[PDB]
Tab-separated table of C-alpha atoms and ligand atoms in Angstrom:
chain	number	residue	atom	x	y	z
A	684	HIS	CA	-92.668	4.323	-29.155
A	685	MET	CA	-92.961	5.437	-32.800
A	686	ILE	CA	-89.939	5.533	-35.105
A	687	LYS	CA	-89.393	6.745	-38.660
A	688	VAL	CA	-87.443	4.789	-41.261
A	689	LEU	CA	-86.517	5.979	-44.775
A	690	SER	CA	-87.146	3.643	-47.688
A	691	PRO	CA	-84.996	4.653	-50.723
A	692	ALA	CA	-85.727	4.176	-54.428
A	693	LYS	CA	-83.515	2.612	-57.093
A	694	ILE	CA	-82.873	3.134	-60.783
A	695	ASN	CA	-81.518	0.610	-63.250
A	696	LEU	CA	-78.442	1.954	-64.973
A	697	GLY	CA	-79.064	-0.421	-67.848
A	698	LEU	CA	-80.820	-3.762	-68.092
A	699	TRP	CA	-80.411	-6.834	-70.290
A	700	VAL	CA	-82.528	-9.949	-70.624
A	701	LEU	CA	-80.543	-13.172	-71.154
A	702	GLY	CA	-83.557	-15.425	-71.694
A	703	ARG	CA	-86.511	-17.277	-70.227
A	704	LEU	CA	-86.517	-19.478	-67.125
A	705	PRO	CA	-88.911	-22.453	-66.611
A	706	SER	CA	-90.488	-20.651	-63.613
A	707	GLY	CA	-91.904	-18.128	-66.131
A	708	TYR	CA	-89.462	-15.453	-64.972
A	709	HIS	CA	-86.360	-14.250	-66.850
A	710	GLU	CA	-82.639	-14.223	-66.246
A	711	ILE	CA	-81.337	-10.670	-66.412
A	712	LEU	CA	-78.279	-8.484	-65.937
A	713	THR	CA	-78.722	-5.011	-64.445
A	714	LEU	CA	-76.892	-2.305	-62.553
A	715	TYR	CA	-78.868	-1.108	-59.495
A	716	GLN	CA	-78.289	2.402	-58.163
A	717	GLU	CA	-79.780	3.593	-54.878
A	718	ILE	CA	-81.078	7.130	-55.225
A	719	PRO	CA	-81.744	9.768	-52.532
A	720	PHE	CA	-85.529	9.531	-53.017
A	721	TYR	CA	-87.551	8.064	-50.147
A	722	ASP	CA	-90.822	6.845	-48.791
A	723	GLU	CA	-91.067	7.648	-45.082
A	724	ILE	CA	-92.245	4.752	-42.964
A	725	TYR	CA	-93.629	5.263	-39.481
A	726	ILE	CA	-93.448	2.179	-37.283
A	727	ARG	CA	-95.383	1.971	-34.030
A	728	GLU	CA	-96.133	-0.728	-31.484
A	729	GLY	CA	-99.683	-2.094	-31.883
A	730	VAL	CA	-101.992	-4.412	-33.844
A	731	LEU	CA	-100.366	-5.674	-37.073
A	732	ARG	CA	-101.367	-3.042	-39.617
A	733	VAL	CA	-99.857	-1.806	-42.910
A	734	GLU	CA	-101.304	1.427	-44.325
A	735	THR	CA	-100.336	3.939	-47.033
A	736	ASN	CA	-101.416	7.447	-48.036
A	737	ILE	CA	-102.358	6.207	-51.533
A	738	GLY	CA	-104.886	3.429	-50.859
A	739	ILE	CA	-102.985	0.186	-51.434
A	740	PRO	CA	-105.050	-2.593	-49.780
A	741	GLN	CA	-103.323	-4.231	-46.787
A	742	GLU	CA	-103.618	-7.760	-48.222
A	743	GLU	CA	-101.858	-6.608	-51.417
A	744	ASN	CA	-99.067	-4.707	-49.638
A	745	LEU	CA	-95.660	-6.413	-49.948
A	746	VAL	CA	-94.762	-5.242	-46.430
A	747	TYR	CA	-97.853	-6.971	-44.993
A	748	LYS	CA	-97.081	-10.113	-47.022
A	749	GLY	CA	-93.527	-10.053	-45.648
A	750	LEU	CA	-94.567	-9.566	-42.016
A	751	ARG	CA	-97.114	-12.419	-42.206
A	752	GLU	CA	-94.395	-14.709	-43.580
A	753	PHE	CA	-92.073	-13.451	-40.819
A	754	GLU	CA	-94.644	-14.630	-38.215
A	755	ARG	CA	-95.159	-17.902	-40.114
A	756	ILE	CA	-91.472	-18.841	-40.510
A	757	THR	CA	-90.242	-17.684	-37.100
A	758	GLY	CA	-93.208	-18.434	-34.789
A	759	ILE	CA	-93.094	-14.945	-33.207
A	760	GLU	CA	-96.260	-12.803	-33.421
A	761	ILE	CA	-95.636	-9.323	-34.901
A	762	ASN	CA	-97.178	-6.379	-33.049
A	763	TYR	CA	-96.358	-3.330	-35.198
A	764	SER	CA	-98.566	-0.727	-36.893
A	765	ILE	CA	-96.983	0.486	-40.176
A	766	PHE	CA	-97.802	3.688	-42.058
A	767	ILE	CA	-95.914	4.404	-45.289
A	768	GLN	CA	-95.981	7.823	-46.927
A	769	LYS	CA	-95.535	6.880	-50.593
A	770	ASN	CA	-93.364	9.387	-52.430
A	771	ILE	CA	-92.106	6.629	-54.724
A	772	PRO	CA	-95.054	5.902	-57.039
A	773	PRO	CA	-95.990	2.253	-57.710
A	774	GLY	CA	-95.365	1.131	-61.305
A	775	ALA	CA	-92.631	3.734	-61.739
A	776	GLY	CA	-89.731	1.245	-62.102
A	777	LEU	CA	-88.066	2.567	-58.949
A	778	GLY	CA	-88.659	-0.469	-56.699
A	779	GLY	CA	-90.721	1.421	-54.093
A	780	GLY	CA	-92.620	-1.598	-52.762
A	781	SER	CA	-89.521	-3.825	-52.725
A	782	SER	CA	-87.706	-1.114	-50.803
A	783	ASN	CA	-90.601	-0.896	-48.311
A	784	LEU	CA	-90.429	-4.682	-47.780
A	785	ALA	CA	-86.637	-4.836	-47.277
A	786	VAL	CA	-86.321	-1.858	-44.887
A	787	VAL	CA	-89.368	-2.700	-42.724
A	788	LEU	CA	-88.521	-6.398	-42.380
A	789	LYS	CA	-84.878	-5.547	-41.602
A	790	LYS	CA	-86.038	-3.105	-38.911
A	791	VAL	CA	-88.708	-5.381	-37.391
A	792	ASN	CA	-86.179	-8.255	-37.386
A	793	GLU	CA	-83.704	-6.096	-35.420
A	794	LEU	CA	-86.453	-4.841	-33.058
A	795	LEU	CA	-87.187	-8.493	-32.195
A	796	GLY	CA	-83.606	-9.490	-31.266
A	797	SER	CA	-82.570	-10.623	-34.789
A	798	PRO	CA	-84.320	-14.043	-34.974
A	799	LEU	CA	-83.307	-14.293	-38.638
A	800	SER	CA	-79.806	-14.048	-40.083
A	801	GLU	CA	-78.956	-11.664	-42.926
A	802	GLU	CA	-78.892	-14.787	-45.126
A	803	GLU	CA	-82.432	-15.756	-44.003
A	804	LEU	CA	-83.801	-12.201	-44.173
A	805	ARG	CA	-82.431	-12.071	-47.742
A	806	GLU	CA	-84.290	-15.301	-48.555
A	807	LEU	CA	-87.523	-14.005	-46.947
A	808	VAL	CA	-87.649	-10.658	-48.845
A	809	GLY	CA	-86.211	-12.212	-52.036
A	810	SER	CA	-89.038	-14.754	-52.217
A	811	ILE	CA	-91.580	-11.907	-52.467
A	812	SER	CA	-89.613	-9.546	-54.757
A	813	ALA	CA	-86.397	-10.124	-56.758
A	814	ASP	CA	-85.598	-6.392	-56.387
A	815	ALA	CA	-86.015	-6.473	-52.579
A	816	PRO	CA	-82.621	-8.020	-51.653
A	817	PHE	CA	-80.846	-5.084	-53.326
A	818	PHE	CA	-82.425	-2.792	-50.721
A	819	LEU	CA	-80.787	-4.775	-47.920
A	820	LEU	CA	-77.418	-3.432	-49.156
A	821	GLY	CA	-78.179	-0.293	-51.198
A	822	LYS	CA	-75.517	1.887	-52.865
A	823	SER	CA	-74.481	0.343	-56.234
A	824	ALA	CA	-74.769	-3.362	-57.127
A	825	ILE	CA	-74.782	-5.663	-60.158
A	826	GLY	CA	-77.930	-7.764	-60.189
A	827	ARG	CA	-77.741	-11.205	-61.727
A	828	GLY	CA	-80.031	-14.234	-61.745
A	829	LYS	CA	-83.474	-12.668	-61.452
A	830	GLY	CA	-81.827	-9.624	-59.838
A	831	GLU	CA	-81.342	-11.120	-56.368
A	832	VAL	CA	-77.787	-12.409	-56.934
A	833	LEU	CA	-75.916	-9.248	-56.100
A	834	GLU	CA	-72.392	-7.932	-56.481
A	835	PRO	CA	-71.553	-4.556	-54.869
A	836	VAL	CA	-69.509	-2.161	-57.033
A	837	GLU	CA	-68.089	1.363	-57.062
A	838	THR	CA	-69.189	3.545	-59.966
A	839	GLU	CA	-67.616	6.671	-61.433
A	840	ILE	CA	-71.112	8.161	-61.855
A	841	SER	CA	-71.929	11.389	-59.959
A	842	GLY	CA	-73.771	14.703	-60.480
A	843	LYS	CA	-77.315	15.721	-61.412
A	844	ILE	CA	-79.964	13.170	-62.246
A	845	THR	CA	-83.572	14.111	-62.955
A	846	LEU	CA	-86.479	11.662	-62.861
A	847	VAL	CA	-89.589	12.284	-64.917
A	848	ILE	CA	-92.403	10.008	-63.824
A	849	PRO	CA	-95.615	10.022	-65.866
A	850	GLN	CA	-98.932	9.154	-64.180
A	851	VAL	CA	-99.113	5.807	-66.032
A	852	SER	CA	-98.348	2.701	-63.961
A	853	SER	CA	-96.211	0.158	-65.832
A	854	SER	CA	-96.947	-3.503	-65.150
A	855	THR	CA	-93.580	-5.258	-64.875
A	856	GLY	CA	-95.240	-8.580	-65.798
A	857	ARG	CA	-96.943	-7.210	-68.919
A	858	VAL	CA	-93.611	-5.755	-70.131
A	859	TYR	CA	-91.651	-9.019	-69.573
A	860	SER	CA	-94.504	-10.917	-71.340
A	861	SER	CA	-94.063	-8.872	-74.515
A	862	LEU	CA	-90.446	-10.101	-74.827
A	863	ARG	CA	-89.384	-11.873	-78.066
A	864	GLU	CA	-86.202	-13.793	-79.031
A	865	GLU	CA	-84.770	-10.669	-80.704
A	866	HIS	CA	-84.756	-8.830	-77.337
A	867	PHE	CA	-82.354	-11.253	-75.624
A	868	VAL	CA	-78.571	-10.829	-75.503
A	869	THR	CA	-75.608	-12.987	-74.453
A	870	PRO	CA	-74.347	-12.465	-70.877
A	871	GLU	CA	-70.921	-11.535	-72.325
A	872	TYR	CA	-72.340	-8.617	-74.326
A	873	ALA	CA	-74.224	-7.348	-71.248
A	874	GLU	CA	-71.230	-7.805	-68.899
A	875	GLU	CA	-69.071	-5.620	-71.179
A	876	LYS	CA	-71.823	-2.957	-71.194
A	877	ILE	CA	-72.164	-2.984	-67.374
A	878	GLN	CA	-68.384	-2.567	-66.937
A	879	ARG	CA	-68.422	0.528	-69.147
A	880	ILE	CA	-71.343	2.112	-67.264
A	881	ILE	CA	-69.622	1.369	-63.944
A	882	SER	CA	-66.573	3.282	-65.250
A	883	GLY	CA	-68.858	6.279	-65.878
A	884	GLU	CA	-69.872	5.730	-69.497
A	885	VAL	CA	-73.566	6.558	-69.056
A	886	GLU	CA	-73.979	6.707	-72.839
A	887	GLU	CA	-73.663	2.885	-72.683
A	888	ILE	CA	-76.928	2.480	-70.715
A	889	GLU	CA	-79.684	0.647	-72.587
A	890	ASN	CA	-82.754	-1.296	-71.474
A	891	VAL	CA	-85.001	-3.454	-73.688
A	892	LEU	CA	-87.836	-3.400	-71.106
A	893	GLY	CA	-87.850	0.402	-71.614
A	894	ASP	CA	-88.090	-0.044	-75.393
A	895	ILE	CA	-91.134	-2.286	-74.875
A	896	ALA	CA	-92.699	-0.141	-72.111
A	897	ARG	CA	-92.563	2.826	-74.527
A	898	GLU	CA	-94.696	0.830	-77.010
A	899	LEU	CA	-97.142	-0.618	-74.446
A	900	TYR	CA	-97.552	2.739	-72.653
A	901	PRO	CA	-97.381	5.659	-75.164
A	902	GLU	CA	-97.090	8.272	-72.377
A	903	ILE	CA	-93.714	6.761	-71.366
A	904	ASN	CA	-92.691	7.427	-74.994
A	905	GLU	CA	-94.080	10.992	-74.807
A	906	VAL	CA	-91.825	11.675	-71.771
A	907	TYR	CA	-88.904	10.020	-73.583
A	908	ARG	CA	-89.332	12.260	-76.650
A	909	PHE	CA	-89.810	15.354	-74.459
A	910	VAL	CA	-86.452	14.724	-72.726
A	911	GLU	CA	-84.764	14.428	-76.167
A	912	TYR	CA	-86.395	17.706	-77.232
A	913	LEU	CA	-84.900	19.194	-74.043
A	914	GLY	CA	-81.444	18.181	-75.356
A	915	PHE	CA	-80.664	15.219	-73.090
A	916	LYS	CA	-80.267	11.495	-73.656
A	917	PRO	CA	-83.195	9.830	-71.845
A	918	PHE	CA	-83.021	6.475	-70.089
A	919	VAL	CA	-85.751	4.238	-68.651
A	920	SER	CA	-85.614	2.694	-65.149
A	921	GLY	CA	-86.903	-0.895	-64.700
A	922	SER	CA	-89.883	-1.684	-66.936
A	923	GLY	CA	-90.870	1.968	-66.688
A	924	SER	CA	-92.614	4.219	-66.191
A	925	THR	CA	-89.705	6.417	-65.043
A	926	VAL	CA	-87.542	8.208	-67.581
A	927	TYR	CA	-84.337	9.733	-66.219
A	928	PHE	CA	-81.560	11.913	-67.587
A	929	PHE	CA	-78.234	13.354	-66.392
A	930	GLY	CA	-79.047	17.052	-66.086
A	931	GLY	CA	-81.276	19.562	-64.319
A	932	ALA	CA	-84.957	20.363	-64.757
A	933	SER	CA	-85.627	23.553	-66.720
A	934	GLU	CA	-88.792	25.665	-66.129
A	935	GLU	CA	-90.134	24.328	-69.417
A	936	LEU	CA	-89.934	20.708	-68.182
A	937	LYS	CA	-91.463	21.722	-64.816
A	938	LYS	CA	-94.268	23.460	-66.726
A	939	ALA	CA	-94.844	20.443	-68.989
A	940	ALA	CA	-94.847	18.157	-65.919
A	941	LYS	CA	-97.349	20.267	-63.943
A	942	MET	CA	-99.665	20.432	-66.983
A	943	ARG	CA	-99.381	16.716	-67.801
A	944	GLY	CA	-99.236	15.272	-64.287
A	945	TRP	CA	-95.620	14.140	-64.480
A	946	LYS	CA	-93.551	14.051	-61.321
A	947	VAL	CA	-90.143	15.700	-61.623
A	948	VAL	CA	-87.534	14.612	-59.081
A	949	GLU	CA	-84.210	16.422	-59.110
A	950	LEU	CA	-81.461	14.435	-57.426
A	951	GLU	CA	-77.691	14.544	-57.020
A	952	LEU	CA	-75.641	11.338	-57.246
B	662	NVG	N1	-86.069	-11.240	-63.205
B	662	NVG	C1	-87.376	-11.108	-63.404
B	662	NVG	C2	-88.118	-10.323	-62.520
B	662	NVG	C3	-89.485	-10.175	-62.715
B	662	NVG	N2	-90.105	-10.826	-63.802
B	662	NVG	C4	-91.590	-10.663	-64.026
B	662	NVG	O1	-92.184	-9.549	-63.262
B	662	NVG	C5	-92.643	-10.116	-62.006
B	662	NVG	C6	-93.547	-9.067	-61.276
B	662	NVG	N3	-94.979	-9.337	-61.501
B	662	NVG	C7	-95.850	-9.559	-60.512
B	662	NVG	O2	-95.556	-9.564	-59.317
B	662	NVG	C8	-97.299	-9.823	-60.955
B	662	NVG	C9	-97.664	-9.128	-62.276
B	662	NVG	C10	-97.706	-7.605	-62.119
B	662	NVG	N4	-96.653	-6.821	-61.887
B	662	NVG	C11	-97.073	-5.565	-61.813
B	662	NVG	C12	-96.408	-4.361	-61.589
B	662	NVG	C13	-97.133	-3.170	-61.566
B	662	NVG	C14	-98.515	-3.187	-61.767
B	662	NVG	C15	-99.177	-4.394	-61.988
B	662	NVG	C16	-98.450	-5.582	-62.010
B	662	NVG	N5	-98.802	-6.850	-62.196
B	662	NVG	C17	-93.211	-11.505	-62.402
B	662	NVG	O3	-94.577	-11.428	-62.797
B	662	NVG	C18	-92.399	-11.920	-63.627
B	662	NVG	O4	-93.281	-12.292	-64.701
B	662	NVG	C19	-89.297	-11.612	-64.675
B	662	NVG	O5	-89.785	-12.195	-65.648
B	662	NVG	N6	-87.971	-11.726	-64.441
B	663	BR	BR1	-89.751	-15.403	-76.956
B	664	BR	BR1	-100.049	5.305	-71.514
B	665	BR	BR1	-92.182	7.960	-81.974
B	666	BR	BR1	-82.374	2.988	-71.233
């Protein structure tokens, strides 16, 4: 009785770090934007299995971690075989794995007569990834706390957006660990910035994790400089590796990408 479910990506339309938390993590402000860029997930009745087309081990897969915890918390034994076709590359700053977790666990929860509430499902996915709760709502949302405290918004942002994803995988943890005092801002500064971006002022997007990712992973910086050379303002999603801009992909970019192993994703917001 196989079904297909789409698992969308996100971009951060700006990100600010407020400071450190005792738990090791960081308090942040960010604007999440769901983008029409998907993994396709095939769900089938059978022995609990989570597989991908890119060789992520089952034990390490956030979806498998989430389904085991589902069983654990709720008592019910999960009998679904999951295959995910991964169009959203891991380490790309697009929340692919967090999206996989949210959409699968929301589906499996519904398929089993909704044992968990939307409050409890939120807690389940949120405990594994701070970006996962966003994918339970999608569209546009302000992310506060560690990103899980969410406020839906309407933006004035539409039109072409192009992603340029280099083959380097950015470690979110390594980027956050390179943070210094100088990188932090007040929540007031960041809140003013987010308001402006929401009103369509894309020029106001900035992201200190992108600044750092460009130093830690020089290829992210190469993509960044190439987009400038193309005549666009580049922006970085999450902790990288993705660089995006508000414009179309020229043949020259497509050529550069094919030669260098960049993925170019042309979307419309
Ligand atoms: N609001 C947040 C959200 C996340 N984080 C950091 O990134 C989180 C994600 N990291 C991990 O799950 C383990 C480290 C890691 N992340 C990777 C991403 C890609 C490739 C390898 C990685 N190793 C936490 O480690 C935390 O230090 C944080 O400090 N503050
Ligand atoms: Br520090
Ligand atoms: Br690199
Ligand atoms: Br440079
Ligand atoms: Br940026």
